[PDB]
Amino acid sequence: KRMRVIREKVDATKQYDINEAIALLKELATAKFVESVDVAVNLGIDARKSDQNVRGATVLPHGTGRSVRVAVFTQGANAEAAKAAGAELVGMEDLADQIKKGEMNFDVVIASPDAMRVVGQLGQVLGPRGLMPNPKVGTVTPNVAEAVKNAKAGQVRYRNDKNGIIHTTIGKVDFDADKLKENLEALLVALKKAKPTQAKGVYIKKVSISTTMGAGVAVDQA
Amino acid sequence: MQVILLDKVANLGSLGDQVNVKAGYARNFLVPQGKAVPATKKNIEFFEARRAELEAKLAEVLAAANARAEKINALETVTIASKAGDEGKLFGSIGTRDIADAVTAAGVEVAKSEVRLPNGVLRTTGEHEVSFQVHSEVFAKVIVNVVAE
């Protein structure tokens, strides 16, 4: 199938280096547009525990400012404050259906703490893509008007799902061998620094690369 | 109780089949009756030596046999008489035991097991070519002449 000769590509047993990972990240495009290559890794932490969770941001290699399409979800008067603020898309919990439906056209999502539990329930979709609003990320707060305004200042948030795995787009599919490896190292460095104190044992059991659909390539974080 | 089964396994097992059997039961039966021997460095070196010696000493009896049989094709025919009358056919048949006893009376020592005879072919009176099996790898044939009696 579309996988016949795609398997000859990589060696499931071999653990390629970063440069080779990107060089081997290549050999793996010939499809349609340019798949935003991400980085999937298995963290040695306890998904259930909160102090074990890992969330943060990494200044990877474009897309900030007026161009960014902000989507705010508030309640009551907060809705008007968001409108006057300048948010392209505004609405209450009702718009959670159109999202659950499909409508994904939006770069960032801002919301108030009162609607966080209902949005959290539907966080399975925004979670991995790092679109879910969070306090530390300065995405959730009563003064939504100031949030959207502050927006356009420049971060690719990352979080570990229930499975205990965390990923994030390093960039796209191809990209000059140098550029990608340049971002992969950056993401890994930002991840190791996010390792919780309580976490014992090997933090990164296995690092790799991922996005939508493709063969496999194991890499050495070092 | 790891012991070496030599007797019953697959007709014979005098090679080296180590198997863990019942303790005490083997020292009272298998061993005393002579059916198996304990699997102990000196012994394994002694018995496995028989293997090498077997293949080493081996072929003189085979090489001599083949040459001996090749000489028979120079002497020819081995006449055998048996009652007949059914228009060329006999009232009975010359089995393997009869062949081994008849062929040996000619001048060669051959057992019945060496006489490859799937089915009694000797039913008519004439010249037949019987097949033999000196070894699972070596085969031969003899020209027999069934005479009417």
Added chain:
RNA sequence: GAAGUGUGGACGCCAGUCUGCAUGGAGCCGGCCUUGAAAUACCACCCUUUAAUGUUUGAUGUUCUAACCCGAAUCCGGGGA
């Protein structure tokens, strides 16, 4: 790791690409890259289905044999897994 484009082929059954070919126009790597009846990119999950091949285990049937059974003083004979 030649094939893809636009108008050409097959061994069990139905379609995207791929290889040693043959050739042109369709353009160079493409094809790729915003049409209602014709629409998009890099490592795991869930039915996974169906088909084919190989290995292991269990059950049933058939055949061959050193067990076992009977006859005989013995040799041995009959029977027979």
